[PDB]
Symmetry: T
């Protein structure tokens, strides 16, 4: 069936490509947060183990919300290691950092997702895509709140 939602196909394609980067960054942050949840040690173990659990649980919902918007626009949602590695701007961490460096990297990760979200708003400038704008806004809100909670631990 045709897709008749007030956005041309070329614009929908461009928006889906932007949201694909957002999905890749969100998913990459999801796994890094999960990773640090398992692997953190030291006197902050209990508090960070729990904090990182709350974060990755939220990000698992977020990846669905972003993927579903891509589908609503009429495009497949990427979902493989190869696709996400190509699309993601998150810095990979292959070892086990000290707890304070884990915190720092997760702050940087929140800010990287915000930066990707901000990069999509220009694609919406000439277009009427209020739902996508709202999704970007909700993601920025969560990541900016999470950045505050994380960087507070480093004070």
């Amino acid at each position: 069936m045709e897709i008749n939602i007030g956005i041309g196909e070329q614009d929908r394609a461009a928006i889906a490509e932007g949201l694909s980067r957002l999905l890749a960054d969100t998913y990459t942050l999801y796994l890094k947060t999960h990773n640090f949840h398992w692997n953190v040690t030291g006197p902050m173990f209990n508090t960070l183990h729990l904090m990182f659990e709350g974060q990755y649980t939220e990000l698992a919902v977020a990846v669905d919300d972003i993927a579903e918007r891509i589908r609503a626009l009429g495009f497949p949602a990427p979902g493989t290691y190869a696709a996400y590695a190509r699309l993601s701007s998150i810095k990979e961490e292959e070892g086990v950092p000290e707890a304070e460096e884990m915190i720092r990297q997760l702050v940087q990760g929140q800010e990287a997702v915000v930066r990707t979200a901000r990069s999509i708003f220009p694609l919406l400038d000439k277009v009427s895509d209020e739902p996508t704008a709202d999704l970007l806004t909700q993601r920025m809100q969560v990541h900016e709140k999470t950045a505050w909670m994380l960087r507070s631990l480093l004070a």
Copy 2:
């Protein structure tokens, strides 16, 4: 008491007029979806009976949310067959279509509500009615998601 929310009376009346159309389209889609929930048959009965139930349950809440926004603007919320027949832009189905045609009509219905919402946005941008703009945005999100799920069923 006067209404002092940063939107003048003429503009609030115009927003209420638009939301009355959105309310009527949402209600018409609600009743059509409820109808199809009762009346669908064929091998997809269990999946569509359930899917249409989720949809009309969500739409019943949306009807309340739209009507309450009209009230917050200072105007009566329409709520009769006669009013909704005039205000709506969705054709009702008077018979019992095959399941695939029911699906197609509900795709078109989602898009008709999005189209009505789209007709109201320029007014909201002009007068800066941020809460109504957010309401319309949420409706567009829901309807565009539901259109994806429905049309997916028609793919080969």
Copy 3:
């Protein structure tokens, strides 16, 4: 597939027609109650907004129970503005009455549905349809209880 539930097709058709009137009245009362929920004002706002919400929430379940009995008898459940306007005996209200008149109209609405339910029992005279009789009975119970609560508000 054949329907073999101890009621012949001609009787099932007649009972389904009667229940179609009950469905239309119940749905029309549902929307009127929803309408008054949004639109009531005055010192009784909070209590009537809440009371009417309880009522239309219940009526939304009731319309399913009625429509599903029609389907069990082997007939399509009506569900459009045109079909309900034709079948309904509820008096339409296109304006915004005072709170006390909203209450009076909803009492009349309860009693109108009861009258419609009572009108169906003769169709069951010569047939064995205990489930339909029970459905009518349950609706009469709910509407008679609601009528007491509503009219109590109009006493001194």
Copy 4:
């Protein structure tokens, strides 16, 4: 202690005999539905696995309700394979039919329980056993609704 509930002992015995047949048929349909839940295959697996689960869960409660009514009347509730094989009127399926034949058999099973309940009503009318009549009415309501949902799957 004496049982003084307005029905004499011989009539209570007769009602308990009838309910024993209804219990056996309900239990036979319960086990058949549970069987088909485990064993159904094909593209309708997910939806029929779930649909049949809802049905056998409901029937498990019904068997308790029927057995407890026999106890209230002063008689033991039958509860063995031998008793249910004798008292039932539903043929069990010993193999694994295709999904559409499973559905067809469950339609016929609902109608079989209705037919057994129908066989008991003249006695209940004669001795005015209101609680048992209401129990049979609820069972007919459930089975007739379930028959609609099942046979709908066999339509085009």
Copy 5:
């Protein structure tokens, strides 16, 4: 506001008189059960303290259902010691019986409520009061089930 539910005033008064007897019986059995819950002793303490709690909790709801039906018919619901002592057919117990005698009295109490309910049906048939008949039927179901559970405790 008038009551127009298909039953004339003198007939509604007659139904309310019957239900006032049923309410008084039910409330008196409620307090007796509550009393025995507090006061039972012996090796059956835990089981009877719990069983009686379940019963009086249910009866507290039932007294509401009965009182509300009286109100729906247009009459005040009795609710004093003097009114219930006058209307009730339950035997008063001013002491603390042995556990087995408490059980026996509670069996008789269930049957007293059933007997009152059974006396009301002919009037309901005459004037076609279907909701009240269903109320009576549901109470008979609960009380006849409870009588079975209670008297079972007295067997060998």
Copy 6:
């Protein structure tokens, strides 16, 4: 088995007699509140129907708490119309008052239960029965709160 809880039998009997009056008053107020819940009419119907429901639901628990304290002291809990009518100081209402008179009577009923509870403390002053004193105090707290809510409606 003997009762050895630090209170002699004659004192326990006297305390149980006082609590029997409290139980009778509480139960009589319970039924009056239930009665007015069914029978109230007028423009306050919805609010008073609900308010009175909350009150009699609470009173149903209270009668259990009082009866169980009587049992813990080693005495039977009264539980019949004749016993409560004999013991109760609540004024009986055989008709259907107007809503404002229902409210007034329920205020008086709360205050009557408080008066009965207060009448028991002198007995405890001699004996040291801390759990009974606490029960009386809880009942006074509830009834004094409820009296405020009720009389506010009449302001």
Copy 7:
């Protein structure tokens, strides 16, 4: 095709064993349900409740066993004729005294355990850890239930 490391002949033999376990469990389920309805005497309330807990558990157990048969690629039996043929539970067509009901339910638990024990040799030279775990869980439940039941028969 089914490639879970077992091979169809062993899957068939294990499924036959689990078919006996299913029949015994289902037959005990119905017998427990029967005794729940039909028990009388001073133990009525406690046995009515105890037997309800047991048959509620067994209703879940029959699903767990049937699903394992399906995972092994065989149909789950489910008729009176099939269960009469497969089951080793002693049938009871009357209404025993409460103490004899308890005794028969003890014997029923032990019969299910005996059937479960008979299946473990079918898992020699097979890698079927999930079936072994299922048998183990059923033995745990029935051995616990047997203790609770036989405790009622002690002096």
Copy 8:
């Protein structure tokens, strides 16, 4: 650690200052509503005690949402009587007004918070802070809805 969220420090500080105003107005409305909840009397006591409770419960959560956005921007959230008395535009009520005047003051309070929120959008437009704009919009929605419910109570 640096804050790199696409908004420079000077603009974050200015937005946080605006949100500090909103927090103070929300908290002052919270305390006023809580106060009126305790102190309201008259025949509307039950309805207003409950309505004001729902409002202050909601506002207790709202102050968290606003305070947390201030923290996300990198600034401390004000939280003392001195700070809120200074920052707020809402005149507190030091006495116990009649119920109608409590309602009127709470309507005015909703509109004062809305006015404060509307005062912040100009800053956000120039700098692009979408999350803060969404927070403002959500608060405006709640307060405009609440203003409708409150002022409805004052109608004739």
Copy 9:
């Protein structure tokens, strides 16, 4: 309608004045705890954010309980910034202390409320106001428990 709860009007006014001070101290501590919840930083952020949330949630219930007792006694409950600043003995904190100083101040706050509660018991000496005494006792219990939890962090 008159208030007849066994306490004369002059005594009720005196008790209500005492409770007004308790309300003001409890509310001031409520807002200080809420403040520190938002504003705390450092490695204890997660645990103190949560701990302070539990505390202010409890104090919000407590201010209702205290205010409602004032209303039950027949007097208006105070509820403005000016009324509470006038009545409160809590030391105000206009800045953002280090986490350890936040903890110390919250210990002091618990002890200040206890002090205010203790100051009211003499009024209840000549007068029998058992519900108010119980309310004071419950507040002291809660605040003394909270003080232990807080000061343990500084050990």
Copy 10:
């Protein structure tokens, strides 16, 4: 930090010593009740297994409440077999008594805890420790209720 709760250190130490005896008695009764829950047999198994579970579940909460009051007073809470064996006045039971003797011992245990609690009030007379007095009162209330339920099982 200093402890400034209006009780001097020497008095807090004496109160903590009394509460340590209460904690030891409560914990010893907790384990004895848990023991009897596992080990009871006979026709009362189901009712006593359950009753003792309710009791030990409550006692597990109480040991926390008592221990936390010791900590609030500024002293360590004892928590070892040696510490409790030294402090406890409960009679130890190393075997498996008959069910009636288990009940009797648990009655004696409730009364022993009450005796210990009562022994502490003299300390609180000279001092002002209202929270500790309330804790003692709540424990006495629970143990006196439980003693009634237990000894009722031993009545004729």
Copy 11:
């Protein structure tokens, strides 16, 4: 601190290596299942969208359970695209297959995880690591149940 759980360090390292492969396969199947959930179309959309959601939700918990057993053994849990792509034996799908091919690939994926689990059991039997053996048993149970449900759709 020493790890003294009855398994020597070299053996724990070898078990962790095997569990790292199992984690990688489970995570790859998790993402593939999540992918197919978003991207499936055709008349089976509703049923497969829901079924695949149930599966990936379960796998998300399983990933946690496997990773935390690795931690309990004293080794870091791998958690990056590069690590999983190196360790995983699952075939990734970079396109959008038809619904029946998605089902077939998910059947293969269940059987692939079972193969990996089966390859680890000999080490666990040699070492007597009973908790890890139970974990692998539960994974085999779930994947074998899931394989039945999936392949039933293709009959």
Copy 12:
């Protein structure tokens, strides 16, 4: 009534003896963990007060499960201070250690329970007691996970 669950009386007695040691160790760890929950202080108070609460709550359930398995085998479950002191291999702490020493003792306590469990498997293999072996395996899983979380705090 006889016990016929496929294990002879002397072998059941031997299993019950092993489980009696396991029960005693689990109960001793339960009380030590409960003690440390009450008594821990210092900057880790919030995280350890909570962590130790979760642990003792879980252990309270574990003692029931172990005790009930002894009963299912036909033997009394030990349940006194004297029995547990005799049977237990955990040394109790009579004082109030620093938080880090509390953590270390609780790690050693987890490993002590595991050590007792491991000693019992040869008997269970010999007589084929599968339910007891699963119980031991579940306890080892919990204790090995808990040891990891505890010792991580010391890194």
